[PDB]
Swiss-Prot record, chain B:
Pfam name, any one: HORMA
Name of this chain's protein: DNA polymerase zeta processivity subunit
KW Protein biosynthesis (keyword) present: no
GO cellular component: chromatin; mitochondrion; nucleus; zeta DNA polymerase complex
Lineage: Eukaryota, Fungi, Dikarya, Ascomycota, Saccharomycotina
SUPFAM superfamilies in the cross-refs: The spindle assembly checkpoint protein mad2 (SSF56019)
Similarity-based family: Belongs to the MAD2 family.
Subcellular location: Mitochondrion
UniProtKB/Swiss-Prot annotation, chain D:
Highest classification ranks of the organism: Eukaryota, Fungi, Dikarya, Ascomycota, Saccharomycotina
Gene name in the database record: REV3
Record function comment: Nonessential DNA polymerase. Required for DNA damage induced mutagenesis. Involved in DNA repair, mitochondrial DNA repair and translesion synthesis. Translesion synthesis in S.cerevisiae may use a specialized DNA polymerase that is not required for other DNA replicative processes. Has a role in the bypass of abasic (AP) sites. Highly inefficient in incorporating nucleotides opposite the AP site, but efficiently extends from nucleotides, particularly an A, inserted opposite the lesion.
Protein name as catalogued: DNA polymerase zeta catalytic subunit
Cellular localization per UniProt: Mitochondrion; Nucleus
Superkingdom classification of source: Eukaryota
Curated annotation (Swiss-Prot), chain E:
Note: Present with 2410 molecules/cell in log phase SD medium.
UniProt keyword Transmembrane helix, yes or no: no
A GO term for molecular function: H3-H4 histone complex chaperone activity
Signal peptide: none
Entry keywords, A to Z: DNA replication, DNA-directed DNA polymerase, Nucleotidyltransferase, Nucleus, Phosphoprotein, Transferase
Protein purpose: DNA polymerase delta (DNA polymerase III) participates in chromosomal DNA replication. It is required during synthesis of the leading and lagging DNA strands at the replication fork and binds at/or near replication origins and moves along DNA with the replication fork. It has 3'-5' proofreading exonuclease activity that correct errors arising during DNA replication. It is also involved in DNA synthesis during DNA repair.
Subcellular compartments: Nucleus
GO CC term (a single one): zeta DNA polymerase complex
Domain of life: Eukaryota
Any single GO BP term: DNA metabolic process
Subunit organization: DNA polymerase delta is a heterotrimer of POL3, POL32 and HYS2. POL32 can form homodimers.
Residues of the full protein shown: 1 to 118 of 350
Name this polypeptide is given: DNA polymerase delta subunit 3
Length: 57, 230, 457, 101, 118
């Protein structure tokens, strides 16, 4: 059985964005920074610092 | 009429704050020694941090300054909370005030500093006052004005200035001289004490100052308000 | 003895000599060789300003310079052919190439946790309007061990040599030792960037006062400042010969303390006018040098520009004509005062407070502060925490010449120490604040000795 | 026309009032800089969750964040716009002109 | 020098309520600090009206300037190197006020660097 978890949250809780960061902040009270996919692909490249790899992981 | 009113308001605010602080009208913890109270005070006059008290003092000063033309004597009355007896009377005599519609800041502030220093010197020598057993009032002496009769026309306000004027007109009640003093029972009658203090004598502002003290009684007066001997 | 007895013992037998006042004794002439030399590394142009970016470039520049310095020092010390007690030391390049039981040395940056203090988190949370739970985001005990990185890998560092030494991320050291049983590197000897050349060293004395914190609430600070001004003129101590040896007076910053969140121009103007009154009352007697402070109305970045030509009373127009700067000079936050041929480095102290606000679970006392100053000097940089101290540029903080005397202001404790790094002697002085425990430091240039004068009430 | 609110007025200032105008400009600049520094510190602390480091190369990652569900990002964007706005350049030019004496 | 500094102190203490320092007498009579301290010592006596609170400081061997507040138990009696009346206070609170003083020729220590205009 597969579930669309964002859809399940939409059916359960009445949020205004239904975004993973927004849902986390609204329910679990945890704030999660969001980075653009370009930032992800620039931080995941080879010969980069260990800090960037730790950040993405 | 622009700089004179500002200096008079600053002096009145410092006078009221010093009188409240040194007479234990309000707890000394609330009072804090400061120089800036939105105006350049002459010295480190202790100003209370209570917002309601600050607003009340500012409104009282503004109301006094609004009718300063017809007011020749401003006094702060100290009355016991338990019984309505005036135990201390401090008077800011405005003999002439040199009312002109036409002196810098250093000389005026120096005169204000001297006046406040004399007031402090008078106040420290006074005995301590018990806590939560004293209250202060404001009594002014006028020459030609009637207060409280401006509401007979059913006037409807349209601006803040007219509303403030109609509020200040009805904020005073008529009293009589030597009203809250003891009624001279005759059994060792109280004898009020008069003390003279120097006042500011700048070119635009001429001010005289003196204070009144009961320094006597016939029982039930000054009881449990002077912290016993000391 | 009673007060009257002391008064009649001391004041009654007044000397009443050497007080003609018609031909006052000339103060010791102390000149600033950098007053007209210009070329200040920390001087920035406001026209360029800060674009809010270009930080990784300065990070790369600092990393490259420190790596080159430490590599040169390692080559000078751990040259080819040198053999340790165990075996010959191998000059390994990559930190992940140390696979064996053989002594070796490598160069890399130091990694640490450096958690924020709870009070700092509470302060920043209340002034953000939507700040998340910073403590919850911090969340585990953290990292209690020092780890090394050189853009190729991260390994664990163990040993008592590195345990008893504070460290801040962004600096590079030369770690030498043997590989441990697990994936960790033992620390036996450490390396630091090569020492910089130092200029060659009855002269006079300089009085340092910092943390005046003049405001419109505390009246005691004004009284203490007036007492200091009277003492600096010889009126209090009456020892004209001793007082006249103070050639210059250096204010290190924090002249006025205010909260920028809620402050009006009138109270700040009142405080500035009081400061100008003090300056005008003390400038004829002694030269005064003004330095920016953390809470003063200056740039929050560490390279603070001088205060302004304005913000002072009209009585200082003669002193601010532009031609007469030798008796009243305003300098940047970091500066090299070449006092009588002695170059001294003075800062407001924002860097030290920046590292102090961090919690490092691997290393607030006077000895701890002195050790922090020692580490700052050894790392060959002024601000190890670049993001907290400075913001962009328009790297001057990388030292190019070691100063004779180190001056740091706004510190709860006063301490002095003479050190010897690379055959060079550097004196570190931490002048305390004047608002609380208002003591000042008299630095004698002839004997490099610092004495403290305490003012009470 | 005018840096301050004289109805109308170079430096765009009719009355000099140097000791007050420069104080007001310094107060405004200091408030903006302190707000920006507090926002940057908050963002760095938030990004420490992924970076696990409080030094350099974490502030860059913190500034790389562009989440639209957090008011701190909007406040930081507004602060950056205010710092980089033409008004800030005008204030700096006025400060330079007033300090040119 | 007598009958003039005493009169000035009397005026500045009673005609207008303001604490007086010795620097005021340096500005007034252009005399040295030792003479002003001797004048304060002379004025401290032969005064029946104790309407002022004298302020006395202590100069220690380590230049530890301290304001005397208790006047009963002063620590390090033998370590004091100088004692004189700092100021005359008409009340308990001091709160001195400072202004611009034209020190044209009252300086006792003059800086080697002079002042030039234009
Ligand atoms: S913006 Fe909101 S989420 Fe992105 S970093 Fe700053 S605080 Fe954390």
């Amino acid at each position: 059985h597969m579930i669309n978890i964002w859809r399940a949250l939409r059916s359960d809780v009445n949020l205004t964005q239904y975004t993973i960061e927004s849902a986390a902040f609204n329910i679990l009270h945890k704030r999660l920074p969001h980075f653009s996919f370009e930032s992800l692909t620039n931080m995941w490249n080879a010969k980069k610092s260990t800090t960037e790899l730790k950040t993405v992981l | 009429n622009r700089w004179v009113e500002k200096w008079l308001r600053v002096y009145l605010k410092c006078y009221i704050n010093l009188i409240l602080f040194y007479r234990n009208v309000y707890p000394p913890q609330s009072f804090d020694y400061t120089t800036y109270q939105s105006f350049n005070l002459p010295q480190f006059v202790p100003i209370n941090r209570h917002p309601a008290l600050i607003d009340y003092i500012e409104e009282l000063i503004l109301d006094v300054l609004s009718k300063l033309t017809h007011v020749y004597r401003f006094s702060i009355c100290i009355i016991n909370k338990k019984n309505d007896l005036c135990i201390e009377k401090y008077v800011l005599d405005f003999s002439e005030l040199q009312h002109v519609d036409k002196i810098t800041e250093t000389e005026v502030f120096d005169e204000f500093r001297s006046s406040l220093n004399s007031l402090i010197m008078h106040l420290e020598k006074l005995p301590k006052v018990n806590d939560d057993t004293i209250t202060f009032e404001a009594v002014i002496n006028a020459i030609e004005l009637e207060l409280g009769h401006k509401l007979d026309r059913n006037r409807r306000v349209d601006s803040l200035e007219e509303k403030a004027e109609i509020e200040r007109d009805s904020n005073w009640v008529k009293c009589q001289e030597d009203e809250n003093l003891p009624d001279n029972n005759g059994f060792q009658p109280p004898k009020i004490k008069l003390t003279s203090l120097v006042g500011s004598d700048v070119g635009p502002l001429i001010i005289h100052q003196f204070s009144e003290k009961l320094i006597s009684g016939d029982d039930k007066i000054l009881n449990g308000v002077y912290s016993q001997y000391e | 003895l009673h007060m009257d007895a002391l008064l009649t013992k001391f004041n009654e037998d007044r000397s009443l000599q050497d007080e003609n006042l018609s031909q006052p004794r000339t103060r010791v002439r102390i000149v600033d060789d950098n007053l007209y030399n210009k070329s200040n590394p920390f001087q920035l142009c406001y026209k360029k300003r800060d674009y809010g970016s270009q930080y990784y470039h300065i990070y790369q520049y600092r990393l490259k310079t420190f790596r080159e310095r430490v590599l040169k020092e390692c080559d000078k010390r751990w040259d080819a052919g040198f053999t340790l007690n165990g075996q010959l030391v191998l000059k390994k390049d990559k930190v992940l190439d140390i696979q064996g039981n053989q002594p070796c040395w490598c160069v890399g940056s130091i990694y640490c946790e450096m958690k924020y203090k709870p009070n700092v988190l509470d302060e920043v949370i209340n002034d953000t309007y939507g700040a998340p739970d910073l403590t919850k985001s911090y969340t585990e005990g953290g990292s209690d061990e020092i780890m090394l990185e050189d853009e190729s890998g991260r390994v664990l560092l163990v040993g008592d040599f590195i345990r008893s030494t504070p460290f801040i991320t962004g600096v590079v050291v030369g770690i030498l030792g043997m590989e441990a049983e697990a994936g960790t590197f033992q620390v036996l000897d450490i390396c630091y960037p090569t020492p910089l050349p130092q200029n060659p060293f009855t002269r006079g004395k300089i009085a340092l006062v910092s943390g005046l914190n003049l405001n419109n609430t505390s009246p005691d600070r004004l009284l203490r400042l007036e007492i200091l001004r009277e003492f600096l003129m010889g009126r209090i101590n009456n020892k004209i010969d001793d007082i006249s040896l103070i050639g210059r007076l250096l204010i290190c910053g924090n002249s006025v303390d205010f909260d920028i969140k809620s402050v009006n121009k009138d109270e700040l103007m009142i405080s500035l006018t009081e400061f100008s009154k003090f300056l005008h009352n003390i400038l004829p007697s002694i030269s005064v040098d003004i330095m920016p402070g953390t809470n003063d109305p200056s740039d929050k970045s560490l390279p603070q520009q001088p205060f302004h030509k304005s913000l002072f009373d009209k009585s200082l127009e003669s002193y601010f004509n532009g031609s007469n700067k030798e008796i009243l000079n305003l300098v940047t936050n970091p500066y090299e005062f070449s006092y009588n041929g002695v170059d001294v480095l003075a800062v407001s102290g924002k860097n030290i407070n920046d590292i102090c606000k961090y919690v490092i679970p691997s290393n607030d006392d006077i000895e701890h502060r002195l050790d922090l100053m020692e580490c700052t000097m050894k790392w060959q940089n002024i601000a190890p925490t670049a993001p907290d101290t400075l913001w962009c540029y328009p790297d001057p903080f990388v030292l190019d010449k070691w100063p004779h005397v180190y001056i740091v202001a706004n510190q709860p404790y006063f301490g002095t120490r003479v050190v010897e790094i690379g055959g060079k002697n550097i004196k570190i002085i931490s002048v305390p604040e004047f608002s609380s425990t208002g003591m000042i430091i008299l630095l004698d240039l002839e004997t490099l000795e610092a004495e403290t004068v305490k003012i009470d009430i | 026309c005018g840096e301050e609110l004289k109805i109308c007025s170079l430096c765009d200032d009719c009355l000099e009032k140097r000791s007050t105008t420069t104080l007001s400009f310094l107060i405004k600049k200091l408030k903006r800089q302190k707000e920006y520094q507090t926002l940057k510190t908050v963002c760095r602390t938030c990004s420490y969750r992924y970076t696990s480091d409080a030094g350099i190369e974490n502030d860059h990652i913190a500034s790389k964040c562009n989440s639209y569900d957090c008011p701190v990002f909007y406040s930081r964007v507004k602060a950056e716009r205010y710092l980089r706005d033409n008004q800030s350049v005008q204030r700096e030019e006025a400060l330079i002109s007033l300090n040119d004496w | 020098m007598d009958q003039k500094a005493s009169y000035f102190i009397n005026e500045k203490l009673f005609t207008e309520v303001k604490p007086v320092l010795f620097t005021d007498l340096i500005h007034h009579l252009k005399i040295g600090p030792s003479m002003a301290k001797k004048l304060m010592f002379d004025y401290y006596k032969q005064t029946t009206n104790a309407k002022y609170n004298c302020v006395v400081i202590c100069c220690y061997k380590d230049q530890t300037i301290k304001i005397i507040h208790d006047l009963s138990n002063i620590p390090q009696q033998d370590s004091i190197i100088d004692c004189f009346i700092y100021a005359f206070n008409p009340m308990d609170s001091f709160i001195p006020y400072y202004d611009i003083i034209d020190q044209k020729d009252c300086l006792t220590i003059k800086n080697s660097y002079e002042l030039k205009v234009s």
